[PDB]
Write a protein that binds this ligand. Structure first.
Ligand SMILES: O=C(Nc1cncc(-c2ccccc2)c1)c1ccnc(NC(=O)C2CC2)c1
Length: 338
């Protein structure tokens, strides 16, 4: 029936409120715990409730990160509450689809996702990355399942901050983060001195996958994944290996244009090659990726969604979001942007 709790709003001062919800059903089970869907009684708005066991010795890192985030391309923490050992419940605004589910529909129908959606989704993913990276926060698990979508508005929201953390130069970090297909080669080599550019490699794998209709670097083991990477980028040099972290197969770099289908836009291929680089510092930053020419169509004042509606918010950048390179506001914010 109706469940009533005293929950603290995600943003603003700590002042708990009585919150009632109903139609509670399980929508996911993972190593962390369970994710439910529920409907708020007052507004009828749908929410996802991520229930995790509370450590007791320390504050939950995912909650601390979520309370600092406020961005149109990041899933909104509406409330949080504790319940029966103690459990933390993160109440997030529900988003009905994911890039994983949508890409699977196109792949099963032997069709590719239209390039207009590839531009819209990748651009919004790079904006969410620019925002979290501006605080030193690395997501560490960028993959299609963590890219929520509203199919009507074409809004994308990054979710699952269970692996996210602030990367401080000089501090070591666990290499065993990030999921199969999307792991940067420095993580496959077990590097503990990686930077936020691991999220950019993962985003590049998502872009290549949306263009190909299948993952670009598949394999259930790191050896297989690394052989697939070497087939595309060629054997990494001794310098490139040192920048990431043995006798590798001497394979020449496959021309990036031949990796994708003939109809693939060349700007999409150019963007891929600048994200999927062995040297972590050579990869584009998320803000530079947003300013790439592959996204120029999104900055045209006449562009509209295939369903006739206007594009979602794309140019409401804040000072925080542009901090890594403020002069890019000239490309990123077009003349017509309000
Ligand atoms: O945070 C959200 N989901 C989430 C977070 N963290 C971990 C998991 C997780 C991981 C492993 C296994 C199982 C679930 C899921 C979340 C928020 C808002 N809306 C949605 N929407 C959906 O799931 C619609 C149906 C596609 C989802």
């Amino acid at each position: 029936k109706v469940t009533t709790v005293v929950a603290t709003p995600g943003q603003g001062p700590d002042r708990p409120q009585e919150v009632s919800y109903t139609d509670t059903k399980v929508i996911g089970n993972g190593s962390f715990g369970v994710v439910y869907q529920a409907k708020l009684c007052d507004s009828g708005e749908l929410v996802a409730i991520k229930k995790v066991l509370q450590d007791k010795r320390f504050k939950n890192r995912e909650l601390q990160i979520m309370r600092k985030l406020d961005h149109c391309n990041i899933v909104r923490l509406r409330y949080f509450f504790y319940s029966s050992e103690v459990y933390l419940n993160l109440v997030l605004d529900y988003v009905p689809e994911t890039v994983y589910r949508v890409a699977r529909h196109y792949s099963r129908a032997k069709q590719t996702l239209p390039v207009i959606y590839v531009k819209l989704y990748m651009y919004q993913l790079f904006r969410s990355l620019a925002y979290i990276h501006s605080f030193g926060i690395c997501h560490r698990d960028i993959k299609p399942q963590n890219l929520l979508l509203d199919p009507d508005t074409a809004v994308l929201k990054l979710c699952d901050f269970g692996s996210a953390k602030q990367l401080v130069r000089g501090e070591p970090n666990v290499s065993y983060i990030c999921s199969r297909y999307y792991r940067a080669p420095e993580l496959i080599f077990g590097a503990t001195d990686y930077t936020s550019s691991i999220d950019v490699w993962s985003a590049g794998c998502v872009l290549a996958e949306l263009l190909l209709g299948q993952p670009i670097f598949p394999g259930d083991s790191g050896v297989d994944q690394l052989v697939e990477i070497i087939k595309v980028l060629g054997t990494p040099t001794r310098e490139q290996i040192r920048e990431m972290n043995f006798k590798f197969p001497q394979i020449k770099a496959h021309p990036w244009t031949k990796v994708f289908r003939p109809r693939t836009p060349p700007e999409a291929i150019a963007l891929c090659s600048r994200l999927l680089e062995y040297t972590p510092t050579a990869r584009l930053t998320p803000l530079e990726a947003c300013a790439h020419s592959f996204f120029d169509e999104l900055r045209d004042p006449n562009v509209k969604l295939p369903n006739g509606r206007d594009t979602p918010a794309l140019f409401n950048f804040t000072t925080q979001e542009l901090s890594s390179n403020p002069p890019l506001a000239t490309i990123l914010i077009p003349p017509h942007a309000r």
